[PDB]
Backbone:
């Protein structure tokens, strides 16, 4: 009932393109402090990619005596992996504050002044070079993306985000997955239930028993890639050239990981087609 | 440049499920008054099914000396078939007044009082049985449909409508049509351009030259089935039992013709797949 938990964590992490390899690390008999550090590292990466908007909280995950993995924010028990992925998404929901574009409204640094996102590159240079902590608001970035930047202590953070809901991603991963099926009326009656209802709807109505009870386990229904944070440290975190390069890097990686998680999703969705 | 015009009219009419057979009627050497009557009859039927909301206008179509077909409303030249189907949709646009649900705001009878759509069936019975002209506002009808009823002179009209845009219909007819293709990256990159843009978009970007110049000819991009008017005449038009049956009939036919036009669309869309 709490077994297959390392693998459950690994699958959650995969929806963010994080090959956390936690199961393998436990099979190698790694010490529990090691597993704890690895769980936390992966979760913080995933948090960099999920786009939920919670950089102002501390994200940890840790083993419990009863074989569970406990996820926490600012140290408060938020959820347990055994309670399922929908339960985790529900745990995060009240701590979010998304605007109309889906972008987070919270300041990464917390309460305080936020410089504009459109700032002239010379002004931003002065902030990078000579300020202590600082933070810009969202600005448009390229190809329907948005970007921002902030420095906490010794580390500069460059975030690039293109919000995209998880439901839609699932339905398009089911577009490819159905697309690979017999040209037949299962299709035409999914597609004619596309001019009437969402695609989990038409695919839970046109399928057989356990389509919903099976799919209610997928983490990809609650989590998907929407941003990418590239970090810099030390002298680089006060160098404007490094920041410009890091922005290029974060946009590139956004493209990459969106593609990669799409591929892994359609693959395992197609693994469910062979099983059927 | 104005040849293939009877067939152009026939194809327009097909988007509403009207097998007008105008081309065949001309090939039989029917007199031009006959062709004129048939063009008008078909167009008025199509107008009953397209859902544009223009029952308060008189719809005629007539042959011109130069081999064209002229479409008119209240006798004003509105458009010519040779100008294309997008031109006709543009001709109709300023005469519409759609609400948020897509349903027409114009009263079928024109300026005047409109009884509520939820009226108690006994009150509606008294209107059917003893009023002269009368008209109800839209009301919900069943399965996401809407319905209304009005009497002009000797004829009672029962309209049942489930608005559904033409763009969406085209994209779902292209879902089935692609669905029938090689499980390959043409798909995965249409479906990953589904989390970014409309489907005419992803299918005009992933295809080759003339996808847009060819598709810009389809009438189904501007017209689709959205309603069905069932009529009654004579004594039946003042009989409440006949009205209740006619409502059942109009909803059934709505289902039918939505299905049938979907089938004809995917068929000719799939005929374009074999041609490619």
Residues:
């Amino acid at each position: 009932q709490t077994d297959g938990i390392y693998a459950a964590f690994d699958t959650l992490m995969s929806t963010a393109g994080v090959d956390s390899q936690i199961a393998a690390l436990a099979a190698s008999e790694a010490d529990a402090g090691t597993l704890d550090a690895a769980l936390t590292q992966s979760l913080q990466e995933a948090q960099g990619r999920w786009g939920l908007g919670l950089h102002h909280l501390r994200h940890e995950a840790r083993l419990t005596d009863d074989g569970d993995i406990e996820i926490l924010t600012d140290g408060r028990p938020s959820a347990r992996v055994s309670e399922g992925f929908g339960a985790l998404a529900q745990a995060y929901a009240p701590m979010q504050a998304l605007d109309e574009r889906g972008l987070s409204q919270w300041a990464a640094l917390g309460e305080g002044y936020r410089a504009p996102g459109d700032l002239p590159l010379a002004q931003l240079k002065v902030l990078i070079e000579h300020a202590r902590d600082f933070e810009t608001d969202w600005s448009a970035g390229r190809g329907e993306t948005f970007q921002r930047v902030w420095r906490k202590g010794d580390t500069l953070f460059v975030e690039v985000a293109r919000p995209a809901s998880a439901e839609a991603a699932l339905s398009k991963a089911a577009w490819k997955v159905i697309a690979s099926i017999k040209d037949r009326a299962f299709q035409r009656e999914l597609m004619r239930r596309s001019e009437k209802d969402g695609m989990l709807g038409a695919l839970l109505g046109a399928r057989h028993a356990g389509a919903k009870a099976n799919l209610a386990q997928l983490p990809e229904a609650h989590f998907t890639v929407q941003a990418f944070v590239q970090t810099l440290s030390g002298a680089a975190a006060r160098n404007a050239e490094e920041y410009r390069a890091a922005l290029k890097t974060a946009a590139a990686a956004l493209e990459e990981y969106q593609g990669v998680t799409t591929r892994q999703l359609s693959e395992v969705l197609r693994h469910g087609l062979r099983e059927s």
Observations:
- Chain A touches chain B through 23 residues (CB under 8 Å).
- Chain A has ten helices and eight strands.
- The first strand of chain A starts at residue 59 and ends at 63.
- The radius of gyration of chain A is 21 Å.
